[PDB]
Amino acid sequence: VLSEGEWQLVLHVWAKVEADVAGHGQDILIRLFKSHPETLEKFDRFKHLKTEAEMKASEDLKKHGVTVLTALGAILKKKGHHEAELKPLAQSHATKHKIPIKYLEFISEAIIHVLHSRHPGDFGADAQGAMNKALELFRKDIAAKYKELGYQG
Numbered sequence: 001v002l003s004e005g006e007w008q009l010v011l012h013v014w015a016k017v018e019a020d021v022a023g024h025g026q027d028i029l030i031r032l033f034k035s036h037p038e039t040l041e042k043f044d045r046f047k048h049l050k051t052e053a054e055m056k057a058s059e060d061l062k063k064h065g066v067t068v069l070t071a072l073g074a075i076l077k078k079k080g081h082h083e084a085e086l087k088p089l090a091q092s093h094a095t096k097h098k099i100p101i102k103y104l105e106f107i108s109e110a111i112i113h114v115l116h117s118r119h120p121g122d123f124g125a126d127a128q129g130a131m132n133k134a135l136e137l138f139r140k141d142i143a144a145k146y147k148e149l150g151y152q153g
């Protein structure tokens with residue numbers, strides 16, 4: 001359970017993301033695909049992008065990044081009361097896309113890295129700690145849903 005103070009830190013930093021969801025989305029995804037190209041193989045529509053330049057050029061990837069961050073922000077804003085939001089998400093990622101929890105840890109790293117790169121002054125140790133806490137809660141609850149749906153991790 002995160003405290004109100006920790007959620008305030010998470011939401012405060014998230015407000016910076018909201019100023020440019022598309023920009024942040026591109027950075028986070030490109031980051032993920034570069035650090036872990038294996039995650040790219042999971043996206044049929046993006047598998048062919050060879051370089052970072054091509055990724056930035058992709059209109060579809062930019063649209064996708066918006067969809068991802070929009071969903072994540074809606075979850076974070078629930079401050080832990082996200083059971084209903086997690087259900088559809090857990091089902092498509094477990095059953096349809098087969099996304100191991102391990103990949104969710106990789107994207108969590110990508111998010112933290114980008115926030116650190118783009119907002120040093122607002123992403124100090126405490127803010128990063130609060131953000132890490134929130135993302136861990138997300139992964140914990142998503143993993144539980146995985147088990148219930150027959151995927152596991």
Ligand SMILES: [C-]#N
Pocket residue numbers: 068
């Ligand atoms: C999902 N990206």
